[PDB]
Amino acid sequence: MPGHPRLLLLSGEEDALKRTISADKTWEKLHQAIVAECDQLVGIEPLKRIQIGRRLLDKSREALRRIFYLSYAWRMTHQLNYLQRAETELLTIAAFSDWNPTHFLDVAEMTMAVSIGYDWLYNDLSEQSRSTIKEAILKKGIEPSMDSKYNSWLRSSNNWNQVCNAGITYGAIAVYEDQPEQSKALISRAVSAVVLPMGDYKPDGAYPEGYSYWGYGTSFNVMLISALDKLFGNDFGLSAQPGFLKTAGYLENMTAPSGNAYNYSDSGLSGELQPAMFWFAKKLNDPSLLWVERSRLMNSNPQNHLRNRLLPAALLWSNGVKVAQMNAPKEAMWVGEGKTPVALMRTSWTDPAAIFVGMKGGSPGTSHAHMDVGSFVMEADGVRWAMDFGMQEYESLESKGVDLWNMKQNSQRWQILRYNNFAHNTLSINDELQAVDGKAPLTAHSSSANFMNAQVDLSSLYKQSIAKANRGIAVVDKAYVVVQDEIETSPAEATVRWTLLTSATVKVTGANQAELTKDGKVLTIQVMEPAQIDFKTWPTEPVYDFDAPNPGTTLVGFEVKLPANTKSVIQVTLTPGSS
Ligand SMILES: [Ca+2]
Ligand SMILES: [Ca+2]
Ligand SMILES: [Ca+2]
Ligand SMILES: [Mn+2]
């Protein structure tokens, strides 16, 4: 086993790292931003153990950012200021009464922070500082993780399992020589337990909870795998778990030409630089996975990156990648199954005016899901024409007493305007909510250049009102988008509402035609089937006083009555003015 440092970057490996960083202007400017941020940190006071409510998490995360940055800077520059400032942070945190195990993410992230510093600075620390820091890792990090009242995340399939197993494993590695049998058992515990959350990447790497939740668990899962690879030369089969390595392709393709994500489920629009993407691109020897991160590294203010507590890992995993001279990905379509299937289609990775469609199957009962099954977003000519409201801020909803996290059919969650199907780009039948027990599979797809498409079976989402419902969405002739619903009624008639949510200005120019205008661009909505419709708009204003305002948005669409015992088609085309 390597001695210290044994986490992520071994004893002499900074020298080769320096060479690749000096050979790339983009990596060099990131490295220098970190070094200059460390110069500022030298003059900033150590953290205090002050919670916000039940959580110390803001402090544990800042501790990770400070100690990772300073420890990286010390190993790369050997500036004494960085060593001493990091040591002061480590001794301060070691003196905390506890690292708040009743919200164990706080302990996990604090343990990772103190462990990286302990390990990366070990050879340059006094025996007294080593002993102080080691005892805090053991007594405030590792020991609470062995307590049944604190470690239920070992049984969970969510981000807590990945994050807590990663953090405690970093502790077990950092203090290995003080308790070898015990640390080996802790490493084994994490390797076995982390398979639970990794199951949800199967089979294709789509992330069931969507764009904003991808970062946390996945990144800590990668910190764990990478540390095992560097320490043991292997990861005990973790990276081979079905679908896990495919999740980098998922995240890359989730960014539309605008730079904004397909923000289904509880998600925001904007992302950030994701250091874990550079690990995936290194493990897979596939720099084409980094096309979106390239834009962030090249264009963004580096101050945006300097809030990222894992930022030095992006440089550790840089793998000699030459950012500016990267080639765009060859594949312009990405499809994945699993609990939340998605299809992500674009006409070009290089043309900023490209048509993009993101569409999803899945279930409203999935963690963080909305009643959005079969919905889509659409961009063209630099404008998002068909949108998704995204999440609503949790704190106000919870403080108001809204039953936000109940996923059952009758839950108050679905009385939140932004979360039910009347505000998403999909069907509502008989004025009903979607069935939360519904699960729409992706049944077929093609990346054919003139007919890129995907199809989902929506029947179980409308089980009580119709016999069958299938939806296809396609990009046709690289020129327009078609949304096609095929509905088979039961022996009862059904009323179907077709909905599109937009921030563009809406003008109904004909009985079957509407013009959307935004940012000096135009898109035309044409209802091809049925031939006879009454175009409508619906307000996006709050319905309940806990609904957030939605200024500048409009719902447009129509309703069709479908007779009993019939097979019917609804077909709508979306044609950019460029087309
Ligand atoms: Ca000693
Ligand atoms: Ca999960
Ligand atoms: Ca409003
Ligand atoms: Mn939504």
Residue numbers in the entry: 34 to 612
Please quote the authors directly.
Recently, a new class of glycosaminoglycan (GAG) lyases (GAGases) belonging to PL35 family has been discovered with an ultrabroad substrate spectrum that can degrade three types of uronic acid-containing GAGs (hyaluronic acid, chondroitin sulfate and heparan sulfate) or even alginate. In this study, crystal structures of two GAGases (GAGase II and GAGase VII) were determined for the first time, and their catalytic mechanism was further elucidated through the site-directed mutagenesis of their crucial site residues and molecular docking. The structures of GAGase II from Spirosoma fluviale (GenBank accession number: SOD82962.1, 81.2% sequence identity with GAGase I), GAGase VII from Bacteroides intestinalis (GenBank accession number: EDV05210.1, 44.8% sequence identity with GAGase I) and selenomethionine (SeMet)-labeled GAGase II (Se-GAGase II) in their ligand-free states were solved at 1.9 Å, 2.4 Å, and 2.0 Å resolution, respectively. Both GAGase II and GAGase VII are monomers consisting of two domains: an N-terminal (α/α)6 toroid domain and a C-terminal two-layered β-sheet domain. Notably, GAGases are more structurally similar to alginate lyases from PL15, PL17, and PL39 family than to various GAG lyases, which further structurally supports the speculation that GAGases originated from alginate lyases.
The N-terminal domain (Met34-Ala365) of GAGase II is composed of 16 large or small α-helices (α1-α16) to form an (α/α)6 toroid domain. The C-terminal domain (Met366-Ser612) of GAGase II is composed of 17 β-strands (β1-β17) to form a two-layered β-sheet domain with four small α-helices located between β5-β6 and β8-β9. Subsequently, there is an Ω-loop structure wrapping around a metal ion (Mn2+), which consists of three small α-helices and small β-strands, with many residues (such as His401, His403, Tyr427, Glu431, Trp438, Arg446, and so on) on top, which might serve as potential substrate-binding sites. Structurally, the Mn2+ is located inside the long Ω loop after the β1-β5 antiparallel β-sheet, and coordinates with the nearby nitrogen and oxygen atoms of several residues such as Asp and His in both GAGase VII and GAGase II (GAGase II also has coordination with three surrounding water molecules), with distances of 2.0–2.5 Å. To investigate the roles of these adjacent residues interacting with the Mn2+, His403, Asp405, Asp421, and His457 in GAGase II were individually mutated to alanine (Ala), and the results showed that these variants resulted in complete or substantial inactivation of GAGase II. Compared with structurally similar GAG/alginate lyases, the results from molecular docking and catalytic tunnel predictions showed that GAGase II contains a shorter catalytic cavity, which may explain why they can accommodate and degrade a variety of substrates with very different structures.
